[PDB]
Symmetry: D2
Subunit: 106 residues, 4 copies
């Protein structure tokens, strides 16, 4: 999958999580988010097509994904404990990371 396309998988699963009823559903939604993040990992964003893979601005772009993945990692443990509402809140809270990268590189 491509960048914008991974981003839509991130967006749709966030919606899936918000609305879910049970631990297995968030389980699965977060799992798909993790894969999408992992895929996005090496992608070059339109805004930075000029920059090299070594620039400060590529390094900082990627860093945003480390944060996201670490946060999906944690939400997933909460899910795996059947702290369903707790996992939804963590899912909701990670929008701060989405936003922080969008405001810089999108």
């Amino acid at each position: 999958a491509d960048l914008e396309d991974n981003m839509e998988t991130l967006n749709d699963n966030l919606k899936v999580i918000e609305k879910a009823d049970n631990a297995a559903q968030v389980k699965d939604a977060l799992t798909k988010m993790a894969a999408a993040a992992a895929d996005a990992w090496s992608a070059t964003p339109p805004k930075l097509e000029d920059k090299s893979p070594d620039s400060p601005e590529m390094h900082d772009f990627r860093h945003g994904f480390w944060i996201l993945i670490g946060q999906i990692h944690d939400a997933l443990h909460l899910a795996n404990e059947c702290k369903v509402k707790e996992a939804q809140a963590a899912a909701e809270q990670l929008k701060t990371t989405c936003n922080a990268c969008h405001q810089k590189y999108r």
Copy 2:
């Protein structure tokens, strides 16, 4: 320090960070934040005086601090990297965590 006291330290240093000029100032403010968070970890909040240290709400209260500390850890690396504005935004973004716990347990 007690829990309200640690919270003030957190709120104050956030202000310090927002307004700061150089890396050393942010470094220092985050460092104090990290100590306050570390101290607050063991505390019992008024709202849960009547629950047990082993409660769901106690295990979830504590968890918020691990999030915050992890996020202060990261912002500090940015500061140490002279990515000052980057560190200020990370500082800014962890109000998400502050708020999430306040809504629940304040």
Copy 3:
């Protein structure tokens, strides 16, 4: 709690985990480790009594605790997920963090 003493709580519970039988035992051992680390957080080590709270060396000493706490945080989730052996391995593996700090500052 004073530093060496927190360290002994860290060492004793590591033994406890290594030998445990059930999830609840490891839960409790890791919980106590977490509190010990959180207390140790701000302590000044003998080797650095002449250094300032702001020095590079104090910052780097503190950093080691960030790592330990984040690793205890993770191991705890594994315990809470009834993945007992997985949690014992994670407990076993964070000896690397113990060691890395001892070799520098002990």
Copy 4:
């Protein structure tokens, strides 16, 4: 890149790091390590071709990558901070993660 291929990228850059002189070299090697880890994340290992992507076994295989990635993230901060030797030692210490997974699923 395939699983075995990502593993060699991991092993090679570890060497590169061991032997390095300056921080850009470590920076660059860790960066490549993170991409390899990110790519590997989705892989199915030969030992579990017969289990399902939903298994206890697959969930636990994947978890090891999150650990490794989290550890590469941290070591990279150290590199970015010109704490070269510190970054080398962190690189070295994450062999504990490499080994833990190999003992289990290689």
